[PDB]
Structures are given as structure tokens and as C-alpha cells.
Amino acid sequence: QMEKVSEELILPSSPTPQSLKCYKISHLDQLLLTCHIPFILFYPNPLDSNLDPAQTSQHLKQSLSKVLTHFYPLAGRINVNSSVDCNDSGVPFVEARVQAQLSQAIQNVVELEKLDQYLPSAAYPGGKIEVNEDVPLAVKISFFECGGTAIGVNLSHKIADVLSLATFLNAWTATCRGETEIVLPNFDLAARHFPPVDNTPSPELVPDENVVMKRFVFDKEKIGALRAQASKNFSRVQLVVAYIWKHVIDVTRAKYGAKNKFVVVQAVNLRSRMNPPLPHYAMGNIATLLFAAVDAEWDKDFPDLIGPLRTSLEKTEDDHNHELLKGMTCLYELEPQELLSFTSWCRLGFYDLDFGWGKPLSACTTTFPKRNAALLMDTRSGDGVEAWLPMAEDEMAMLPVELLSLVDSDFSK
């Protein structure tokens, strides 16, 4: 049970010069949704400090304001498909009080959809409030009775991938700590290497109906089991993707008939795959789609899908435009149940984000309302992998026990 305290718009601490040049929209951005990337950190009550909500909010707001001088496009408004007006309209900053302790509130989140309340605005369609598609950035801080807090961020996907979210949060937290050495964003590179195309529509998101998301947790010991069953050098992600893919194939072939192929698609950072690479601090959607597939009759063991996936990660001799056309070519003559997808928030330093009073207890997100559109995240120990997997309720139910046992709803530990 929470109550809103206030909403304000945070401006950059010095106005954006009419001179300065706002973020130019790239081709890759044009192809993305106008939905937001919803991101949530829960912090315990600090052991060093004894700061008032008011004081904690002041540090946060002043430091946001300072850092928006470098991330000024984030205070503008998006002009969909083409550009961003750097008009310093400001970032919505929401403050709430929740009548409960942190641990009590997040130790048994049965419906992950209820994490919505920690977001400052809608990320996706289908709630009571419409998405504000023009707003690049909004934030919310919720204060618990214990001293614990939650910071929710909605960053527009038309203007950022999760690497760009991380560039932003590293800068914001670091500014809040009062450091002089921030890693500065680069806003120019994206449209240089991927120039936009005129009249390109942004795709609309139509939510699917019977979808729930659960967080399936694979800890060090579980990965070890997978690693060991697979015996070659197997990384954490390959093992987990393979394992889930095997089990969603079984559900798909049992509910629906087996038809054409089964595909899995991973969205990974394109910066490090360029020849030569782009820096991690280039802002914008700079990501690519890597495909793996097995035909309809497949039915083998989960280590058998790893080949397909490893082969999938190979950087190719083919240019971006071709990679994209292949991608779209396969995606469109696929029936909706034949696609499984994974985006990764892996290895982005989210559990190191320290505003000045400690590192997170948990990082979460909200329900992307489409079947089989999953999300891989780090675990607080750097061991293990969290899979945030949305599915049709009836389909999730058909998963085997060895998988469904991994569902974890305690975010307090």
C-alpha cells in the first residue's frame, strides 16, 4: 500500500544551449518500440547513514540535475520516428511512501506484475495509464518504513538499449557519490554508423492476453549441474538458454502440433561485434539479433542445442543490413509459438550501483506482455543467472517440475 508524495520535472542544472545538437535517431532506433525499458533497484536500509527521505531525495534530484547536463537529450521529448527535441521539458521524478518494510514487501512477490507500482509511469500498454511515448526518461523513488528504498526507472526503447541504461546509471550514481570522473555518453556515433531512413514507421506493440512472467533462478550449484550434464567450454548463458529452449520445445510440440522449425533468438550488444568496435558509452539502440534453429522433428537432449547456439554467436562476413534482412525474413513467416527470445542484462554492473549508501539487494523488471520474450539477468553473487520468462499461463503450467522449481518470488534475500 503506497501513497504518492509528489511529482516534479528534473531539469539539467544549466539549460541546454540552443547550439548543442540533440540525439539523432538512427535506423536501429527507428526499428524499435516506443515502449520503455522498466528497471527497478531495491536498497536495504543503510548501515552508515541515517538520512531523512527528504535528504535522500535531495541528493538524488540534485545529482540527476547535474548529470542531465551531460545526458541532456534525456530531458527532451521524442518526436517519433525522426528525432528528439532537446527542449529541456524535464524528467518526471515521482516520490512515494509505502506503508510497509522492504523485506515484508518483497519476500513473496506472487504476481511480478505488482512491481509496476515502483515504476513512475507505464512501460507497456494494457494498464490503466497509457505509455507516454515521447518521454525518454522518468524515475521514481519509494520509501519504506525500515529506511529501505526502491528506485524505478523507465528509459525509452526508441532512444536506448540496456547498455545505454547502464551508461546512464553508472553516471548518475557516480555523480551522486560526488566523483569528478564520470564516463561521458557519446550521442553522435549511433546515427553515423546506422544512418536513419525517411518515413520509417515504429512498430506497435499489441499485448498478448494470457501472459504471466516468472523469475527462474539458476544458482552456482544448478549451473554446475548443467555444466556437468553437458560433458568443450560452456559459459553460463549458453547452458541456461539451451536448457530452457529444450523445455519450451517440448511444451510447444505438445500443445500445438510440431510445424516448421523452432527458433531461438538472442539480442546482444552490437558495439563489440563491429569491425572495429564502437565504445560501450555510445548511446542508442546498438544491438543485433542472433538466430539458432532446429527443425520440427528435433526431440533430443538439452546439450544438443548448444552447437546451434555457439554457431549462432559467430561474427559474420555479412554487413548489418543483410543481417537485419535475414532476421526479418525468418521472423515473419514464423507462427507465433515457434519463436523463443532472450535479451540479456548480463554483466552490466547493476549490482554495483551505489548512490552513496550501498549496493542493491535486488534488480527487477516488469512484465513484457508477449509470449516467450525473455530476459536474462545476473544474480547478486555474480554466480548464476535469472531468467525472466513471460509465457501463456497454460504454457508455463506445462513446463516440467525440474524447471518450475526454479521459480523464485523472494526478492528480499
Side-chain angles (χ1 to χ4, degrees), residues 43-44 46 48-49 51 56 59-60 149 151 176 354-359:
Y43 289 93
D48 330 85
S49 41
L51 261 48
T56 309
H59 279 303
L60 288 171
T149 63
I151 293 157
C176 201
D354 190 338
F355 281 94
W357 50 87
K359 289 186 205 206

Side-chain angles (χ1 to χ4, degrees), residues 162-183:
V162 298
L163 229 180
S164 299
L165 174 59
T167 301
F168 168 63
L169 297 165
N170 293 347
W172 184 22
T173 54
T175 299
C176 201
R177 278 180 285 114
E179 310 273 45
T180 24
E181 221 245 55
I182 280 100
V183 171

Side-chain angles (χ1 to χ4, degrees), residues 127-170:
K128 36 213 227 154
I129 328 304
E130 296 195 18
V131 184
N132 302 118
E133 296 175 52
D134 50 343
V135 177
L137 212 209
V139 326
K140 172 201 254 221
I141 177 142
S142 307
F143 289 89
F144 291 84
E145 314 194 308
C146 52
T149 63
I151 293 157
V153 174
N154 277 338
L155 216 206
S156 166
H157 219 329
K158 172 65 49 179
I159 240 84
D161 56 14
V162 298
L163 229 180
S164 299
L165 174 59
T167 301
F168 168 63
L169 297 165
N170 293 347

Side-chain angles (χ1 to χ4, degrees), residues 106-303:
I106 72 174
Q107 63 178 23
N108 192 21
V109 191
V110 176
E111 286 182 46
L112 298 185
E113 210 22 327
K114 293 311 196 304
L115 296 165
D116 279 336
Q117 64 175 314
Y118 306 110
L119 291 181
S121 51
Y124 304 117
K128 36 213 227 154
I129 328 304
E130 296 195 18
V131 184
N132 302 118
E133 296 175 52
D134 50 343
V135 177
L137 212 209
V139 326
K140 172 201 254 221
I141 177 142
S142 307
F143 289 89
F144 291 84
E145 314 194 308
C146 52
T149 63
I151 293 157
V153 174
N154 277 338
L155 216 206
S156 166
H157 219 329
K158 172 65 49 179
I159 240 84
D161 56 14
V162 298
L163 229 180
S164 299
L165 174 59
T167 301
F168 168 63
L169 297 165
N170 293 347
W172 184 22
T173 54
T175 299
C176 201
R177 278 180 285 114
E179 310 273 45
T180 24
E181 221 245 55
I182 280 100
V183 171
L184 290 169
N186 181 131
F187 284 109
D188 303 344
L189 254 2
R192 295 209 176 94
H193 284 275
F194 316 102
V197 177
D198 299 340
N199 299 9
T200 300
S202 24
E204 48 169 358
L205 187 57
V206 198
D208 301 333
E209 183 89 310
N210 302 316
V211 15
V212 276
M213 176 182 79
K214 303 290 164 186
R215 175 183 60 159
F216 302 69
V217 172
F218 304 72
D219 40 316
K220 197 204 175 59
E221 323 93 85
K222 177 59 174 197
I223 293 132
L226 302 183
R227 186 154 316 192
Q229 191 188 336
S231 305
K232 298 150 214 188
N233 233 82
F234 309 100
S235 85
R236 218 175 289 175
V237 164
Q238 293 178 331
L239 257 20
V240 170
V241 164
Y243 184 74
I244 311 188
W245 195 17
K246 194 253 177 282
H247 301 287
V248 341
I249 297 164
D250 290 350
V251 290
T252 301
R253 177 168 43 211
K255 169 164 163 189
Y256 306 84
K259 290 225 316 304
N260 338 104
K261 43 190 173 152
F262 296 106
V263 189
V264 82
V265 83
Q266 299 187 75
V268 297
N269 176 198
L270 173 61
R271 286 154 190 100
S272 53
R273 298 170 53 95
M274 269 167 277
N275 176 47
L278 286 178
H280 61 90
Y281 51 77
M283 303 286 288
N285 288 105
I286 317 188
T288 198
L289 261 6
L290 309 173
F291 291 78
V294 299
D295 51 286
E297 309 142 292
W298 181 80
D299 195 11
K300 299 156 91 80
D301 307 288
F302 94 76

Side-chain angles (χ1 to χ4, degrees), residues 82-108:
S82 39
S83 68
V84 185
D85 284 21
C86 266
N87 55 10
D88 292 345
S89 297
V91 342
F93 199 101
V94 175
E95 282 178 39
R97 217 313 259 348
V98 4
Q99 281 163 100
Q101 276 164 61
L102 193 281
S103 264
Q104 210 89 354
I106 72 174
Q107 63 178 23
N108 192 21

